[PDB]
Amino acid sequence: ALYEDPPDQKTSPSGKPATLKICSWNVDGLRAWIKKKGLDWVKEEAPDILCLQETKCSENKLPAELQELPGLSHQYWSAPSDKEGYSGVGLLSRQAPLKVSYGIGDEQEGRVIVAEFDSFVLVTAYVPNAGRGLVRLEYRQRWDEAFRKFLKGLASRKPLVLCGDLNVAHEEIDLRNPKGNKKNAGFTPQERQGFGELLQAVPLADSFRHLYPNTPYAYTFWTYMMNARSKNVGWRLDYFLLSHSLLPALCDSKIRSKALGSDHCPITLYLAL
């Protein structure tokens, strides 16, 4: 009940070598995550693209160490205008995207960055948490609806990759305590249906569950409290979701459960494009 992520499959079903490595990480405080050596892990992981969520850092206070990642030299950031010490997402890339946009066209929450690359469109997202005591479930629901729609008017062109902290465990297989949470932010019936509607409407596939439909105990977040992380008492809240057109390029989708720095761990996608 502790999990041991399988080894990296760097070759596709069709037998092609992976060409693109995307890593996503909810850093839950970018500056503190940097002080806990996050960039040291990323330098080692060496993705072609890195997405970060819950940065809690204005553009003005972005530590200069970020510029010390020259293989990820094109960096895009999004923060909420009025709110400080809240949300915030980032997308760091080896090559410049052809176009970068921010938000989902309502408005500013600093949760979504859209980057169009050569062969596909990457969205990273820090989905609103429903709140302790579901105090913001009703904001999460409108966000879910709005997001689904925005994404539909998006994957019409090129295939999609959507990664990030989606703040929902989809099925019971995705957390350790399904029964003790069916009314807690992240496993309510509304949220889980939002995630099912997300996969239906766009459509997308859960990259990890596609390759590991039976694997239990595979989580990406553990509360800092108790010793949930050591006890692997956690949730799978961080995803790579993919257009079906991409599934044939899908080499592997990982959970880097050993990487510290936050109450989430990184996840890494390998695509053969």
UniProtKB/Swiss-Prot annotation:
Which amino acids does the record list as binding Mg(2+) 1?
N26, E54, D263
Mutation effect (C265S) = Does not abolish NO-induced nitrosylation. Abolishes NO-induced nitrosylation and translocation from the nucleus to the cytoplasm
Could you state a single Gene Ontology molecular function term? transcription coactivator activity
Question: Could you say which EC number(s) this protein's record lists?
Answer: 3.1.11.2, 3.1.21.-
Q: Where is this site: Interaction with DNA substrate?
A: H264
Q: What are its GO biological-process terms? A: base-excision repair; base-excision repair, gap-filling; cell redox homeostasis; DNA catabolic process; DNA recombination; DNA repair; positive regulation of gene expression via chromosomal CpG island demethylation; positive regulation of transcription by RNA polymerase II
**Which positions does the motif Nuclear export signal (NES) occupy?**
22-38
The reported result of mutating R256A is: Reduces the interaction with TOMM20. Abolishes localization in the mitochondria
Residue ranges of region Mitochondrial targeting sequence (MTS)?
244-273
The disulfide bridges present are C23-C51
Q: Could you tell me the superkingdom of the organism this chain comes from?
A: Eukaryota
Full protein name:
DNA repair nuclease/redox regulator APEX1
Q: Which organism is it from?
A: Homo sapiens (Human)
**What's the name of its gene?**
APEX1
